[PDB]
Amino acid sequence: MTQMYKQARSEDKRAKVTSAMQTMLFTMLRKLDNDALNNIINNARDGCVPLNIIPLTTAAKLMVVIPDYNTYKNTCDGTTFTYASALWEIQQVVDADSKIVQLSEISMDNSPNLAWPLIVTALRAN
Amino acid sequence: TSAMQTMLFTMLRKLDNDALNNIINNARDGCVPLNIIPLKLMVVIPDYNTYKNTCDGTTFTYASALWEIQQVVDADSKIVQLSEISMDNSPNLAWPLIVTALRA
Amino acid sequence: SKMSDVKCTSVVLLSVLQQLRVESSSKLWAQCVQLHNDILLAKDTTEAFEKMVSLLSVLLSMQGAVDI
Amino acid sequence: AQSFLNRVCGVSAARLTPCGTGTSTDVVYRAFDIYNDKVAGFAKFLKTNCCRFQEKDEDDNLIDSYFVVKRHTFSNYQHEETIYNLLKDCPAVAKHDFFKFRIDGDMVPHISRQRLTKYTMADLVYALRHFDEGNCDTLKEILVTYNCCDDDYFNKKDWYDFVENPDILRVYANLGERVRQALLKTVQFCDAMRNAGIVGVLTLDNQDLNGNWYDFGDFIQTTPGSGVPVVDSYYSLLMPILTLTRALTAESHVDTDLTKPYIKWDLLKYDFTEERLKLFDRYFKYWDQTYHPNCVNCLDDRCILHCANFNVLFSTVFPPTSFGPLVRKIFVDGVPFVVSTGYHFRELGVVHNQDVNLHSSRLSFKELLVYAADPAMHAASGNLLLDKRTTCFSVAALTNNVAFQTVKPGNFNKDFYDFAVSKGFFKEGSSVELKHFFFAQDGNAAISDYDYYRYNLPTMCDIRQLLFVVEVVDKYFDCYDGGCINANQVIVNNLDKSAGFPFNKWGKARLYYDSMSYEDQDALFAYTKRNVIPTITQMNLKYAISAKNRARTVAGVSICSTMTNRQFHQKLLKSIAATRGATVVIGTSKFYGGWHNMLKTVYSDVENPHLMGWDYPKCDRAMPNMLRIMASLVLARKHTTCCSLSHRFYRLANECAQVLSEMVMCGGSLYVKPGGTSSGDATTAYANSVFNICQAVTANVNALLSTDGNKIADKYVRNLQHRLYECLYRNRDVDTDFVNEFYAYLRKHFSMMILSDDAVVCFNSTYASQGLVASIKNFKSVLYYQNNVFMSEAKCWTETDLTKGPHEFCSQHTMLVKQGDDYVYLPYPDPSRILGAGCFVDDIVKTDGTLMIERFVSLAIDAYPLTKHPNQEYADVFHLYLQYIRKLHDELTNTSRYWEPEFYEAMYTPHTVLQ
Ligand SMILES: [Zn+2]
Ligand SMILES: [Zn+2]
């Protein structure tokens, strides 16, 4: 009754993965500990909230993925738009090749010259 | 990686299709497409020894088909009327010519 | 066997194109993937050759790759 | 004459077309839900008693309302008259008119019921549960009459299809309001019966499509206030179309009217138990079985099924942002976290973990593993994501940029191709050629492939039928051995699989099987028996051969999911894979006579035998959650002496939260997977087999119940059908004798050979033509209404000559060859597949040569039976492969030398069973 208590190939292999998990958790909870989450949870009936609303109501950065222009025009038209009952301000639109697309290029005549899955990064406005 | 490239070229030579051999011969001369050939084609012509062999009047022989030259622009980035190409006044023509045509 | 030759040549040509780092261009790699897939699925031995010249133009549009 | 019309009009709707005066309008088939001492079933009969006048609306245009005037004996007329005078002042009772007319010399008494539609709820339910696009005239007429579409819609191609033309869902959902009004009228009627002391059975064929009721001929009067309606057959037969027509879609509006804004639910709300109880007590008031909104409180797997079936329907009313892990904020050494302390399933309700430790002290390896696999901290620290490329629910984006994965072409093996060309292959005008390749993929392939989960729709099942099919399936699975095993009895092969997210960052599964002690693994198991661990699944693009340019995907399930599913299911899966001669033939090698023995077992003793096979369109994307849950419960029935009910329920909840409605890491983002199997789980090849047997047993049940029991000439099959209807819709108990009896009937007349998603059936063709066992149209109908897919009869085969076996099984054909005065069945592949796999390699073998020769001898093993083929190019294939393997072995430099033909021959004979 030794290999049931102890591991087999510990040999600083168990330590590597536990320190990896530890640093990942402690680098996640550093861009996470804020007061938006406190005011979200502290208004629940018993402190328990669905997970699908945590980013929706506390995230400070949105990313919109847009396939084509008749969706860009219906979704992200302008420099500020509205989503999830909040007001977002656009910044740094990018195309599928990780290249910056200026807002003065997304029209109907220049459409074919854009790598089309466009990624719009927006910040939550107050 | 030149192993894979010489494999590709020996296979292309084995295929022995005349359209493929034509575009390969032009690419070896210097006459090169600047975009995927459309099934709006724009092509670089190096010089007139290559221009006269292919382009006759307005009509363009490439990929063993016919194209109607819609716009020719010399290297100087300025429209040229294709009725100025000569065999003695050939110097002053900016000789890498971008010729743009459509398939007739 | 002029169809199996064309389909194997299509495989080799897309391999060399991928090695030339054209998947680092979304639009161009999408066009080349479409050409290669339709050449592989083709059943007529002349539109396969049409798509083949269209796909080889991609490789030899890059002003210099080998073409010694 | 016309006097009969002047009288049947009475004092309402003086404008009636003379559509009948004798016993006319009797040239029609109508669907009936009949049960008496001679017949029992839900089938189409020839109703010939009526005389149906049709009202003509103002301006002489005909309207959908009829006066159905029947001729009754005096006793039944008096009885029905009294019961109507009781139930008269209820709004959900069609008006009746009782009169007498002088036919020749006797005042014959007639009963004319007023303003009924042309069809009834039974006609609608039968049209949708016995669908056949050859003759769907009743369905077309209903959909047109009630303004769901127009007459020209059906000129469309594949208008009935779900996966092509998915607008048929919008065309069906226009009957939802009508179906919901029918449910409300039914509850009104049941109340009016109870408060009047009227005992009777409610059958669908007594409710017109407006909602009214009639035909009080079998009710009996009791003491008032103590009536009791019987609604089992009604509600259970109606159930499958409540989700197909989205009947409750009006329950998510402000005041349950489709012309008002949506209910803006609270965003922090996740319980919904009182709303579910309100919905049940509103629509199914008299369904006299206890409904538990949170299946945690269930009693047995049958109760879990019964109540998850209701939660599936009631959960389409609630906001989709309220399902999924329920996070809480815990403290570790003072630093706060967010961790899942529960879950909210669409099917199982709210589940709460029992071992939650607020204000922790430290993190050991087990709890570190749990917290790292938990998607709470991953989705709470990532950006909000709005992905307009899909309709699936997106949770968060874990990065600052989306990742676009592409797939490469295959590696051309030019030496082999030149060898084949010099031998003489691929010549123009040949039957063997290249048809299988590696199709390259562009950036929009991962998400375009993930978006197929839109084919997984919420579907309610006929529960009274499922609760019997599950007993017959568990009869199919009762020669095995299951139970939990300690962590030191688990044998794990392929220790280099994907460890899911976020573990694939630090190693394969080998890392976590070598880091965790046996005690740690046992503790993690015993933990999952009391808590829910939601995990994340990685979705990658596969690099494999196909004849279609579609993108093939692969899934990596978390290590903390696979590690415990192994201890739960390893014993049963080993027992299934190590047994020969059963229905579910998994892990039975086709060599040394395995194919011949499999076939001789399928053919076992069926009398007039025909072979049949079918396929499931979009099986893994479209398998319903109720059926996946049923499969997992059937598999978990082996744990009766080691796990109590709480342990088995929490194992079911973990399995759901991990491989049914998991979060999927696609690209660099988290999406919500609606349902369907995961190709990366070790259990799906067996869950698919349970699902396969379920659908086959269901097709048999429907074929036996939908046949006119008066024309069945066998007085044994008549009693079998009668008792089948009883055991389904009466007799809430489980009848073990009849379950054994029906299982024996099936095994005698419908023999199956099942592997995951693949089946071969040997059936009595006489019974199948009489309608007593399942044909292929019965499978088409069952798939349509229980899988939301349309199965074309162009992908289903049938074989009348058994000496040439199944046309296709596990991608193998069958040929009857001679092996020393003993004719045996041998499996041969597709020569195109063999040649393709030979010419295109994966660049792992283009470097070393021993792996190349291993690949080529495996191919020449799979391509030996072709030598016995009558076609000559097929034999030439194997000769080519052998010549090439000899060339390779000579380049590198008796029955175990892989370069002679007798190494391969011995692989297909049972006299040398050595591996
Ligand atoms: Zn229950
Ligand atoms: Zn157990």
Residue numbers in the entry:
A (entry chain B): 67 to 192
B (entry chain D): 84 to 122, 127 to 191
C (entry chain C): 1 to 68
D (entry chain A): 4 to 896, 911 to 932
Give sentences from the paper:
To inform drug design, we determined the structure of nsp12, in complex with its cofactors nsp7 and nsp8, by cryo–electron microscopy (cryo-EM) using two different protocols: one in the absence of dithiothreitol (DTT) and the other in the presence of DTT. After the collection and processing of 7994 micrograph movies, we obtained a 2.9-Å resolution three-dimensional reconstruction of an nsp12 monomer in complex with one nsp7-nsp8 pair and an nsp8 monomer, as was previously observed for SARS-CoV. The polymerase domain adopts the conserved architecture of the viral polymerase family and is composed of three subdomains: a fingers subdomain (residues L366 to A581 and K621 to G679), a palm subdomain (residues T582 to P620 and T680 to Q815), and a thumb subdomain (residues H816 to E920). Motif A, composed of residues 611 to 626 (TPHLMGWDYPKCDRAM), contains the classic divalent-cation–binding residue D618, which is conserved in most viral polymerases including hepatitis C virus (HCV) ns5b (residue D220) and poliovirus (PV) 3Dpol (residue D233). Motif C [residues 753 to 767 (FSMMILSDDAVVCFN)] contains the catalytic residues [759 to 761 (SDD)] in the turn between two β strands. The NTP entry channel is formed by a set of hydrophilic residues, including K545, R553, and R555 in motif F. The RNA template is expected to enter the active site composed of motifs A and C through a groove clamped by motifs F and G. Motif E and the thumb subdomain support the primer strand. The product-template hybrid exits the active site through the RNA exit tunnel at the front side of the polymerase. The catalytic metal ions, which are observed in several structures of viral polymerases that synthesize RNA, are not observed in this work in the absence of primer-template RNA and nucleoside triphosphates (NTPs). Overall, we found that the nsp12 of COVID-19 virus has the highest similarity with the apo state of ns5b.
